[PDB]
Design a protein around this ligand. Structure first.
Ligand SMILES: CCCCCCCCCCCCCCCCCC(=O)OC[C@H](COP(=O)([O-])OCC(O)COP(=O)([O-])OC[C@@H](COC(=O)CCCCCCCCCCCCCCCCC)OC(=O)CCCCCCCCCCCCCCCCC)OC(=O)CCCCCCCCCCCCCCCCC
Ligand SMILES: CCCCCCCCCCCCCCCCCC(=O)OC[C@H](COP(=O)([O-])OCC(O)COP(=O)([O-])OC[C@@H](COC(=O)CCCCCCCCCCCCCCCCC)OC(=O)CCCCCCCCCCCCCCCCC)OC(=O)CCCCCCCCCCCCCCCCC
Ligand SMILES: CCCCCCCCCCCCCCCCCC(=O)OC[C@H](COP(=O)([O-])OCC(O)COP(=O)([O-])OC[C@@H](COC(=O)CCCCCCCCCCCCCCCCC)OC(=O)CCCCCCCCCCCCCCCCC)OC(=O)CCCCCCCCCCCCCCCCC
Ligand SMILES: CCCCCCCCCCCCCCCCC[C@@H](O)O[C@H](CO[C@H](O)CCCCCCCCCCCCCCC)COP(=O)(O)OCC[N+](C)(C)C
Ligand SMILES: CCCCCCCCCCCCCCCCC[C@@H](O)O[C@H](CO[C@H](O)CCCCCCCCCCCCCCC)COP(=O)(O)OCC[N+](C)(C)C
Ligand SMILES: CCCCCCCCCCCCCCCCC[C@@H](O)O[C@H](CO[C@H](O)CCCCCCCCCCCCCCC)COP(=O)(O)OCC[N+](C)(C)C
Ligand SMILES: CCCCCCCC/C=C\CCCCCCCC(=O)OC[C@H](COP(=O)(O)OCCN)OC(=O)CCCCCCC/C=C\CCCCCCCC
Ligand SMILES: CCCCCCCC/C=C\CCCCCCCC(=O)O[C@H](COC(=O)CCCCCCC/C=C/CCCCCCCC)COP(=O)(O)OCCN
Ligand SMILES: Nc1ncnc2c1ncn2[C@@H]1O[C@H](COP(=O)(O)OP(=O)(O)O)[C@@H](O)[C@H]1O
Lengths: 122, 44, 49, 320, 104, 459, 347
């Protein structure tokens, strides 16, 4: 029920191991970052609407801070997420390699020699 | 001609202590407006 | 128009506005610098450039 | 720094401002007695802030520009037509009484906020404590129903229990034939229609419920019609009162902090005035409600929060 | 009151033809109404209907039906010019199929 | 697919930043422009679908549905702006926003490459529709209608979610191309029987299948006019499209799992058509007619032949146009006399002649007059069903008769006879209403000239 | 209550939870629970009245019983292995006792009776705390000992929680009891996936806490605790009721809203472990929660209920206090489904 908590050589509260730096960072126009910025913009607009201020005009410094905070946090969130998926794939490939008797390569047939069952539609 | 909106009799379906009133919960009374019950005259 | 204090009057709080804009600007430059450093370290670790 | 928990923590206290002339004072009396002149004189002598009696448009005085709003957007009741047709089947009478109780509650909150924040005392004309005399008068004259009285009592039971009663209760006593004399000599064509039974009911409610009740937690100063033009003598009578009776000597900084957090935040004060009890006199249907609210939001300074209406000349909206 | 509530009376609906005898039924403002009519008619009947139907009518033969007809013509010419069957009941070459060897 | 999608999204702030008196003009103009751009998806390769990207693709099944959606939006705007005149600017913008969000969800659902994305968008269409019905619905009964529309739909679609995630765990993918190329037969087991049911029942309740159809008269009758238009024209077709996609992983089980659904659809075809003969409400009659037509589509999809799939596509498109036109026609009279009862206003041909012409043409396409595409679809389905079993002609033949009967009954009751003497507020037809009817009708007639466009992938 | 005292008590509640979360020793985890309860009882009675007293009394009795049981489980575990470290329980009987103790602390069915009563008896701020922060400690403990727990007991209590949350919520007009039954059903969802993937438990908890914070803050902003009192908010603050409508649909789990993500993730994980049947039941039963959310949205935002004359006076006053995080909470409660793959950062 806890697959990656017990992995060896894992620092308790890093959020970003040093090994993560071997991975390409997300581009600054990453559509997920753009969506995080859009979330910040919606937060700014709802903020204006709740306090009965003009919705698109009232606080531009405030809306800018909303957008910037969301983009800033989202960048690091994306880094950590991509790093965790890289760990998953690394471990899966290493395990398949070290246990070849569990992942055998069997000879595959062309469809000319596989007998498939035919079911007429009528 | 205008769109129908709830009136007092419609709104009062949601004013009881409970939805779906039965014979037992009929004598349940909704709590006070502020959450303050009148003090009891349990004279010590 | 209005009768009493109306704490935000005709002029805006320049302290709070300055601090908010400064926070946004600092966050953006920190993020740009962080992304530059990330790209360079990644290229260095794998021998791209 | 808006007053809150942080302001109370670092420094701010109430007791260090109370300076022996704080003394919430209310000057009651029947219709067309001279209680208003006496109240202004007491306030000017003792140096207290005066509050003219709360009317239908008291709330307008405190928000936006202090100008009154139209009657359909504010109040939705008429004191004149209560005098003309007190038994009208559109519920104007209890609507008026309930709106006036709400206005007096708002004014009591404003006066307590002034006192607790500046230490200076206040003088009120009537109160949420004496408001019920008109209700009982209307009910005995067949002007309102039993249900309206029950609703009034509910709202009062959940609202008036939150505040401290006044230190001094001044009652200007004028017999009802003198009252009628003053009414006819005034000139108001509507007030002419006030019967003698109505004024007698107001006076009976006063003298048998309000004064005996306030005399238990407040000290009462009664004055007949003639001995009430002597403002110096009344102020001398107040300066030599030993306020040792009510809940005010039982108040330390924490109870004052709770009260001061309540008396600001007018929405919290007015919370229980609109409880979902569906009396025909005060219930407004969805269509009229929607129309009147839309019309309110189109008033020249009311669409946005105070400092954000550029139609009224507000500036730097983008930067606020 | 013998009433239940303070409610506005249900209003009568207003005839757009009363203040504007030629009102097109789009809007109370006669100018906005006229321009709503014009934009609807131009962008629906002129742009989308006519030009769109023309565009769809002259769509290139990406479904490859002309190509298929010419291909079938080549095949038929070659096949009955050589005496070969027009079509074979086998879609795929039986020499590329390896059936299971024994059937009992 | 991005070229169609972004402008649709753009429509959102364009309407939120428009002047109070120009919202309808702006929305209508740019909706029509979007419809024109979409028109370019009808160019199809032949052998395979156009795959724009990993996330989106268009088919010959898909292209007709998208064009109908985009074309329906401006018509809904024309139909709405009359009864929404008294509304505040903000609420009018909110209504238009609901319609735009609905269009956006619909376009994406039809073009999503994989089933989980299709499921999410196919379910996201529920929120704007429910809000439209329950907030702008005229009657008190709208709240009940909204609940019926929601719950019937979710009770079918949640087992589909479970089945889909299970299928991706066992197969490794839900991408429709991989699903098709790696298809393997479904064995005859209890597990596979329940997988079949969980894959089919959501689309069955969307159609709706007879007996699970009770939500539709409620929801279609209690909705505002644009809500009814989109509910009949497009939202019913989600079930057909989803079933046509999903039945590729269900063979050969469909051969006998289809029997009860075929029985229900044929007999309930007869049933709902007969119901239309004794209906006192005019919207109720159009709703049940939609049910009868979708029963035919269910039969076509269940028998799984190329002719039946072609007929199903053609019938879906034709029904979408005709049913929307009939709802708009009923709404004009309702706007006049403020009642849905069919015998209230009579002899309207004497008072409104051009609207009577629109009524006649809509009634003629509803009964599938040749060579309209309604009859093309119906005839193809009937032929496929005949091949499936020669006894289906009796049921099919009976249905054709009852449909003619109630269509002409509606026409005769509302347009012919003498006018009710008391009603004197029947004003001449507005240009808006006539243009709305023409913009429904002209496209249908135009489609007869080029039948292959609405035929589908099998063609 | 002095503001400084209130701050000290909130800090003691939070520090007890953090002690439960950072400890390696069973005794320190027990001490964390004790400290949390000690500081939490006064926060329930902050606004004194008989109902708050009764709620705090029922809460104390339930939580202290759970505490005794928890300690007994720890001691039996020590008896059968000289171990104090919280890893996997050694004794099956100790594990049963521990599971039941933590279920009582969480309010899972059949131990669910206390949650609606205590929530109704306290203020909206204390209810917010009780239904958000008071779940972290037992859930973290359950996540640590997850391999040891028996699936049959856990899943029984989870399915009961979902069913009973739905059924009990159907009957309510008070908003605090509606929120409490909602919480019971949500806890059932969180614990159903626990023996399979604790990351799904954490994700469900985070999204539930976001939506619950948003709902409670919206209920405080429009100071309503009944259905009819919330029916007035349209005639004073329409934006608030629209935002509440959308938050209600997200709680229901309807796509494309965020609330749908936890349900979607949990069902998928379960199917991987060959468990088709449990999930089909869970979703079809969450339909009940959706029903009473929809009823509240009908009475509050989609229709307009009649109002009172005194509302005109409220029209003239702005809210004295504004919640800083309310806008962010609404956006995270509604518009976060496109960010679902970010759950990998939780493991
Ligand atoms: C077949 C004839 C060929 C003629 C060639 C020219 C045709 C051009 C017409 C173009 C399409 C018509 C538009 C329809 C909307 C009507 C607009 C309107 O309001 O009129 C106002 C206008 C002004 O009059 P008014 O004095 O102001 O008062 C009008 C009153 O409202 C009331 O005035 P009203 O009482 O006179 O009513 C108006 C009229 C209009 O109402 C209609 O119903 C007309 C539409 C016909 C029925 C529609 C559904 C049936 C399904 C058929 C689909 C076929 C479409 C093919 C492609 C068409 C492309 C658009 O109603 C009728 O006349 C009775 C209709 C019964 C028709 C039954 C025929 C069945 C099928 C016939 C063959 C179809 C296939 C052709 C090829 C076959 C193989 C060779 O009146 C007219 O102009 C009359 C319309 C002309 C009648 C057309 C009927 C047959 C044409 C069918 C399609 C054309 C096929 C062309 C291919 C070549 C062959
Ligand atoms: C991750 C999981 C997901 C999120 C977790 C779930 C979130 C649930 C959080 C609910 C919190 C409840 C709450 O604070 O108020 C509810 C509140 C509603 O209340 P309200 O209607 O606004 O008005 C209430 C008034 O405060 C009415 O009360 P008032 O008039 O008395 O106003 C006093 C006010 C104003 O405050 C003041 O006056 C400041 C004056 C300072 C006084 C100095 C006292 C210091 C001395 C005590 C030291 C104790 C140390 C403990 C030693 C332990 C030894 C082992 O103070 C407060 O309101 C409460 C202060 C909260 C303190 C927070 C500090 C963090 C403590 C961390 C402790 C951990 C230590 C290390 C642990 C190591 C392990 C052992 O909710 C909100 O306002 C928005 C929700 C925000 C939640 C957080 C957002 C999510 C995460 C980001
Ligand atoms: C999937 C495809 C893409 C989807 C996108 C995502 C979805 C949309 C985004 C969501 C968040 C954004 C908006 C949130 C803040 C809105 C709050 C608000 O009150 O709005 C009022 C405000 C207008 O108020 P006002 O101007 O001050 O004056 C009005 C009067 O004072 C009178 O005002 P009032 O306040 O007195 O009126 C009160 C009114 C106020 O009621 C509301 O405003 C409802 C707002 C609820 C917020 C929704 C929660 C968060 C969003 C979740 C969306 C879920 C989507 C999934 C499906 C669920 C459907 C909701 O309430 C009512 O009247 C009661 C009616 C109850 C009917 C039931 C409907 C309630 C729920 C409907 C939600 C539909 C979705 C949002 C639609 C857009 C709303 C702006 O809205 C705006 O004017 C701004 C809207 C956006 C403009 C910014 C555009 C960007 C800049 C333009 C350039 C374009 C950029 C690209 C560049 C291209 C190169 C050149
Ligand atoms: C509704 C959306 C949910 C919102 C959630 C709140 C988001 C704001 C919270 C503030 C962010 C800061 C938190 C972390 C900062 C540094 C701390 C860091 O070191 O923590 C690490 C861990 O990192 C954090 O866990 C990651 C937090 C990211 C949460 C967001 C994911 C939401 C899922 C998808 C929704 C998309 C959300 C969009 C963002 C607004 C420690 O790792 P470890 O001690 O070994 O693991 C402890 C738990 N174990 C052992 C049981 C595994
Ligand atoms: C009221 C007054 C009435 C009297 C006046 C009557 C006037 C005459 C009316 C009758 C005209 C008859 C015209 C007959 C058709 C001739 C042209 C026809 O053949 O074009 C067809 C093509 O028609 C178009 O394909 C119609 C396409 C559909 C138009 C859609 C409009 C835009 C969409 C609107 C929304 C749609 C919503 C539903 C979408 C599914 C088929 O062309 P095809 O035989 O191949 O051409 C061979 C040579 N080519 C290929 C090189 C051209
Ligand atoms: C109102 C509209 C509602 C929507 C309509 C829903 C329609 C659902 C009906 C499902 C169609 C058939 C289901 C399964 C196909 C065959 C059913 C069964 O009766 O057939 C025999 C099955 O034998 C027995 O009948 C066992 C089933 C009997 C128990 C089921 C209870 C049926 C009572 C009807 C209840 C109504 C159900 C719908 C609720 C609304 C076949 O014999 P056998 O070859 O051995 O089994 C084949 C399966 N094998 C291969 C794995 C072995
Ligand atoms: C095992 C448990 C499985 C859980 C399945 C839950 C199904 C979800 C539907 C929830 C319906 C709840 C209805 C209810 O509780 O009350 C009925 C309700 C009470 O009215 P109130 O608004 O609450 O009060 C008004 C007076 N004050 O009465 C009604 O009129 C109901 C009207 C709408 C009902 C909608 C039902 C639609 C169901 C469609 C079929 C599928 C439903 C789900 C089960 C499918 C079959 C397996
Ligand atoms: C609005 C009304 C709509 C009502 C729709 C209800 C019917 C939906 C179809 C059935 C729903 C549940 C199906 C389960 C989802 C499919 C998952 C699957 O295929 O897995 C099966 C599992 O199959 C099941 O477990 C299903 C059993 C049924 C459990 C729930 C019963 C609910 C009622 C069933 C009958 C109703 C269905 C038709 C009703 C239609 C609506 C009237 C095989 O997996 P394994 O467990 O690994 O087996 C092989 C390895 N040993
Ligand atoms: N609570 C109330 N209910 C009904 N009428 C009130 C109320 N309060 C004040 N009034 C009206 O205010 C009018 C004048 O106020 P009053 O204080 O009696 O005389 P003065 O103008 O000298 O201050 C009276 O005609 C009285 O009816």
């Amino acid at each position: 029920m806890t697959m990656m908590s017990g992995r060896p050589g894992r620092v308790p509260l890093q959020f970003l191991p040093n090994e993560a730096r071997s991975l390409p960072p997300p581009k600054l126009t990453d559509p997920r970052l753009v969506y995080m910025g859009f979330l910040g913009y919606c937060s700014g607009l709802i903020d204006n609407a709740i306090r009965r201020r003009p919705v698109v005009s009232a606080g531009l410094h405030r809306q800018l801070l909303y957008v910037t905070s969301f983009v800033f946090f989202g960048y690091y969130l994306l880094k950590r997420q991509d790093y965790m998926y890289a760990l998953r794939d690394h471990d899966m490939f290493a395990y398949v390699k070290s246990h070849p008797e569990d992942f055998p390569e069997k000879d595959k047939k062309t469809y000319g020699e596989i007998l498939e069952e035919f079911h007429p539609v009528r | 001609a205008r769109q129908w909106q709830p009136d007092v009799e419609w709104a009062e379906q949601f004013g009881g202590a409970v939805m779906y009133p039965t014979k037992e919960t009929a004598h349940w009374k909704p709590p006070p407006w502020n959450d303050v019950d009148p003090p009891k005259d349990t004279l010590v | 128009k209005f009768y009493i204090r109306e704490p935000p009057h005709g002029s805006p709080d320049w302290l709070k506005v300055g601090l908010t804009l400064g926070t946004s600007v600092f966050l953006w430059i920190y993020l740009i610098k962080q992304h530059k450093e990330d790209v360079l370290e990644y290229k260095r670790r794998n021998g791209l450039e | 720094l808006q007053y809150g928990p942080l302001a109370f923590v670092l420094g701010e206290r109430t007791t260090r401002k109370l300076t022996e002339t704080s003394k919430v004072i209310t000057v009651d009396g029947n219709i067309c007695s001279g209680k208003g002149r006496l109240a202004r004189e007491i306030a000017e002598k003792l140096g207290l802030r005066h509050f003219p009696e709360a009317g239908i448009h008291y709330a307008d005085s405190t928000t936006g520009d202090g100008k009154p709003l139209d009657v359909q957007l504010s109040g939705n009741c008429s004191l004149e037509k209560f005098y003309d047709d007190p038994k009208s089947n559109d519920g104007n009478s209890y609507r008026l009484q309930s709106w006036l109780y709400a206005s007096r509650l708002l004014q009591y909150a404003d006066a307590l906020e002034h006192l607790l924040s500046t230490g200076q005392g206040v003088v009120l004309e009537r109160s949420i404590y004496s408001d019920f005399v008109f209700l009982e008068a209307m009910y005995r004259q067949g002007f309102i129903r039993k249900q309206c009285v029950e609703h009034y009592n509910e709202v009062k039971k959940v609202t008036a229990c939150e505040y401290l009663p006044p230190h001094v209760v001044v009652y200007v006593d004028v017999p009802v034939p003198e009252i009628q004399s003053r009414i006819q000599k005034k000139g108001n064509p509507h007030e002419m229609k006030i019967t003698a039974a109505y004024l007698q009911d107001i006076e009976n409610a006063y003298k048998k419920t309000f004064l005996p009740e306030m005399s238990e937690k407040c000290e009462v100063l009664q004055y007949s019609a003639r001995e009430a033009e002597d403002a110096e003598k009344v102020v001398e009578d107040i300066e030599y009162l030993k306020c040792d009776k009510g809940p005010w000597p039982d108040q330390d900084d924490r109870t004052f902090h709770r009260l001061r957090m309540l008396v600001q935040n007018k929405l919290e004060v007015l919370n229980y005035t609109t409880i979902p009890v569906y009396l025909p006199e005060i219930t407004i249907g969805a269509h009229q409600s929607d129309r009147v609210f839309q019309k309110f939001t189109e008033l020249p300074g009311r669409k946005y929060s105070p400092g954000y209406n550029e139609d009224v000349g507000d500036k730097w909206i983008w930067l606020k | 009151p013998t009433i239940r509530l303070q409610e506005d009376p249900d209003p009568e609906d207003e005839n757009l033809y009363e203040k504007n005898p030629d009102s097109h039924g789009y809007d109370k403002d006669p100018i906005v109404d006229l321009w709503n009519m014009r934009v609807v008619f131009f962008f629906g009947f002129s742009i989308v209907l006519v030009l769109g139907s023309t565009f769809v009518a002259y769509l290139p033969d990406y479904r490859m039906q002309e190509w298929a007809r010419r291909e079938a013509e080549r095949l038929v010419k070659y096949r009955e010019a050589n005496g070969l069957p027009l079509m074979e009941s086998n879609c795929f070459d039986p020499n590329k199929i390896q059936l299971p060897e024994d059937e009992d | 697919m991005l070229k169609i999608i972004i402008p649709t999204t753009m429509l959102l702030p364009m309407t939120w930043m428009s002047k109070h008196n120009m919202i309808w003009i702006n929305a209508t103009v740019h909706s029509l422009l979007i419809s024109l751009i979409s028109l370019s998806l009808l160019n199809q390769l032949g052998e395979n679908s156009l795959n724009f990207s990993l996330t989106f693709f268009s088919d010959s099944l898909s292209a007709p549905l998208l064009v109908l959606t985009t074309w329906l939006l401006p018509l809904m705007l024309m139909a709405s702006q009359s009864h929404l005149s008294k509304e505040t600017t903000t609420r009018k913008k909110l209504y238009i926003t609901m319609l735009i969000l609905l269009q956006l969800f619909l376009i994406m659902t039809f073009t999503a490459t994989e089933l989980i994305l299709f499921y999410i968008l196919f379910e996201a269409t529920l929120v704007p529709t429910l809000i439209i019905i329950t907030r702008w619905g005229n009657q008190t009964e709208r709240l009940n209608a909204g609940l019926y529309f929601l719950f019937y739909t979710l009770a079918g679609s949640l087992p589909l979610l479970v089945a889909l995630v299970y299928i991706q765990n066992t197969t490794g993918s839900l991408n429709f191309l991989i699903i098709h190329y790696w298809s393997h037969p479904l064995s005859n087991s209890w597990s596979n029987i329940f997988m079949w049911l969980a894959c089919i029942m959501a689309f069955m309740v969307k159609m709706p299948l007879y007996g699970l159809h009770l939500w539709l008269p409620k929801a279609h009758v209690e909705a505002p006019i644009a809500g009814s238009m989109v509910l009949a024209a497009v939202l019913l077709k989600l079930g057909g499209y989803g079933m046509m996609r999903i039945t590729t992983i269900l063979n050969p089980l469909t051969n006998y799992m289809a029997y009860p659904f075929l029985m229900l659809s044929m007999w309930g075809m007869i049933m709902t058509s007969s119901i239309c003969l004794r209906q006192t409400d005019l919207k109720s009659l159009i709703a049940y007619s939609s049910v009868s037509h979708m029963a035919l589509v269910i039969v076509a999809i269940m028998i799984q032949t190329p002719w039946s799939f072609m007929g199903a596509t053609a019938l879906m498109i034709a029904h979408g146009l005709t049913s929307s036109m009939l709802f708009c026609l009923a709404n004009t009279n309702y706007e006049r006399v403020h009642s849905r009862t069919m015998i209230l206003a009579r002899g309207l041909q004497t008072l409104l002649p051009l609207m009577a012409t629109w009524w006649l043409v809509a009634s003629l396409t509803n009964l599938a007059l040749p060579p309209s595409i309604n009859l093309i679809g119906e005839l193809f389905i009937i032929t496929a069903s005949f091949s499936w079993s020669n006894i289906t002609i009796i049921l099919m033949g009976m249905n054709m008769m009852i449909t003619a009967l109630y269509s002409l009954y509606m026409l005769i009751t509302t347009q012919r006879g003498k006018y009710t003497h008391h009603i004197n507020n029947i004003k001449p037809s507005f240009t808006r209403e006539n243009a709305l009817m023409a913009l429904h009708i002209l496209p249908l007639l135009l489609l007869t000239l080029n039948p292959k466009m609405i035929l589908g992938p099998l063609y | 209550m002095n503001p400084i005292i209130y701050t000290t008590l909130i800090m003691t509640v939070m520090s007890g939870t953090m002690l439960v979360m950072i400890s390696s020793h069973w005794l320190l985890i027990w001490i964390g629970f004790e400290m949390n309860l000690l500081a939490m009882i006064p926060v329930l009675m902050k606004n004194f009245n008989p109902r708050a007293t009764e709620a705090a009394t029922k809460y104390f009795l339930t939580q202290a019983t759970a505490s005794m049981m928890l300690m007994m489980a720890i001691i039996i575990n020590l008896l059968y292995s000289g171990q104090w470290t919280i890893t996997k329980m050694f004794n099956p009987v100790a594990m049963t006792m521990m599971t039941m103790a933590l279920a009582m602390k969480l309010g899972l069915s059949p131990f669910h009776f206390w949650v609606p009563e205590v929530t109704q008896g306290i203020s909206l701020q204390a209810g917010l705390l009780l239904l958000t922060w008071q779940k972290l400690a037992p859930l973290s403990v359950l996540c640590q000992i997850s391999q040891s727990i028996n699936p049959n007991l856990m899943l029984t209590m989870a399915m009961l929680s979902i069913l009973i949350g739905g059924w009990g919520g159907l009957n309510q007009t008070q908003l605090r009891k509606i929120m409490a039954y909602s919480s019971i059903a949500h806890m059932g969802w969180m614990t159903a996936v626990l023996p399979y993937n604790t990351t799904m438990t954490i994700l469900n908890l985070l999204i539930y806490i976001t939506m619950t914070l948003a709902m409670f803050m919206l209920l405080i902003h429009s100071s309503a605790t009944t259905t009819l009192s919330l029916s007035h908010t349209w005639n004073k603050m329409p934006v608030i009721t629209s935002l509440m409508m959308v938050t209600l649909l997200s709680m229901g789990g309807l796509p494309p809203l965020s609330g749908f993500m936890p349900k979607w993730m949990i069902i998928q994980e379960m199917t991987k472990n060959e468990s088709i049947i449990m999930p089909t039941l869970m979703a079809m039963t969450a339909l009940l929660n959706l029903y009473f959310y929809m009823r509240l949205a009908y009475s509050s935002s989609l229709t307009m209920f009649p109002s009172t004359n005194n509302m005109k006076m409220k029209w003239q006053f702005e809210h004295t206090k504004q919640m800083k995080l309310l806008p962010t909470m609404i956006v995270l409660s509604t518009l976060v489904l496109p960010m679902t793959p970010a759950l990998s950062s939780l493991n």
